[PDB]
Ligand binder design. Sequence first.
Ligand SMILES: Cc1ccc(OCCN(C)C)cc1C(=O)N[C@H](C)c1cc(-c2cnn(C)c2)cc(-c2cnn(C(C)C)c2)c1
Ligand SMILES: [Cl-]
Ligand SMILES: [Cl-]
Ligand SMILES: [Cl-]
Ligand SMILES: [Cl-]
Ligand SMILES: [Zn+2]
Ligand SMILES: [Zn+2]
Ligand SMILES: [Zn+2]
Ligand SMILES: [Zn+2]
Ligand SMILES: [Zn+2]
Length: 307
Amino acid sequence: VFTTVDNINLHTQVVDMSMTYGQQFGPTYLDGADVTKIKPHNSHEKTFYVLPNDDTLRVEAFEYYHTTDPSFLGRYMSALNHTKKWKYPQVNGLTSIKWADNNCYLATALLTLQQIELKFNPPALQDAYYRARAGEAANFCALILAYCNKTVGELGDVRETMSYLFQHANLDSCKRVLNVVCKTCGQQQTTLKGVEAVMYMGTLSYEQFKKGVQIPCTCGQATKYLVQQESPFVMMSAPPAQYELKHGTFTCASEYTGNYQCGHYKHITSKETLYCIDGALLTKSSEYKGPITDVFYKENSYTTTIK
Ligand SMILES: Cc1ccc(OCCN(C)C)cc1C(=O)N[C@H](C)c1cc(-c2cnn(C)c2)cc(-c2cnn(C(C)C)c2)c1
Ligand SMILES: [Cl-]
Ligand SMILES: [Cl-]
Ligand SMILES: [Cl-]
Ligand SMILES: [Cl-]
Ligand SMILES: [Zn+2]
Ligand SMILES: [Zn+2]
Ligand SMILES: [Zn+2]
Ligand SMILES: [Zn+2]
Ligand SMILES: [Zn+2]
């Protein structure tokens, strides 16, 4: 019998058939199911996931997941019991998810991550991220739910899910410098780094951010524009409104229709033409107009031209 916390460093233990796994190993999981109350069986003699009970397992658990929350393995194994049953079709060369248990926001996020450049700091996230691009995205979706502290069936927001994931990614080299102009106060330059340098809530178009956005001032309206952007991408979010998506001006977008929270997501991507991925469904179009809430753009190093 093998016990592990990372499926890498395995620990071989000797088991019997009298006591259950709970008494011998603590809460133990096979695949995604809970074999805590289940007694050992013949075909079980394989590797089992156990909650860390010593310092060696606690250290290995942090090295793989970068978390010390004792409930993390439980939330992760509970989500995996559903995600392993989902279907992950290949739509337009991308891995999507067939609709199941309100996974519309998870599918839009999964398709978005396969199109932007991202390096995850937790090794467990990075390893499953690679398998997700290759078609095996069950572990990756389950880990996303665990890190975001969300459960299967819960209604998720794509912008909130991306932000949670961005905080577990290497965005240290990302830098955004803004300039807020105000006729009374003057000019103030602010520098953002990391997660805050790649996301903005207000407008959907990256060009309006470069031209200037009407932002309030402490004295009372100013204008904020982008001076310099050094990031592999930018995420522009705005409340759901009708927007015009043109081929070649963006990478991918998030469509939200329906009421607040209990609504549905769809993924729009710009290839040789505009593609609409709704789980397992694909529709193409030369132009698009609909309710868009998130737009992702590509970037490397931008520097403004206004004094
Ligand atoms: C699907 C879903 C799941 C979870 C969730 O959790 C939010 C709670 N969270 C704070 C923890 C939200 C959503 C969700 O509805 N998302 C969508 C994208 C959404 C729709 C609407 C909206 C308004 N009218 N109608 C008919 C729809 C408004 C907005 C909106 C507005 N302003 N903001 C910014 C500033 C925070 C966002 C977001
Ligand atoms: Cl960490
Ligand atoms: Cl992390
Ligand atoms: Cl609202
Ligand atoms: Cl772009
Ligand atoms: Zn970490
Ligand atoms: Zn389910
Ligand atoms: Zn299920
Ligand atoms: Zn002012
Ligand atoms: Zn849905």
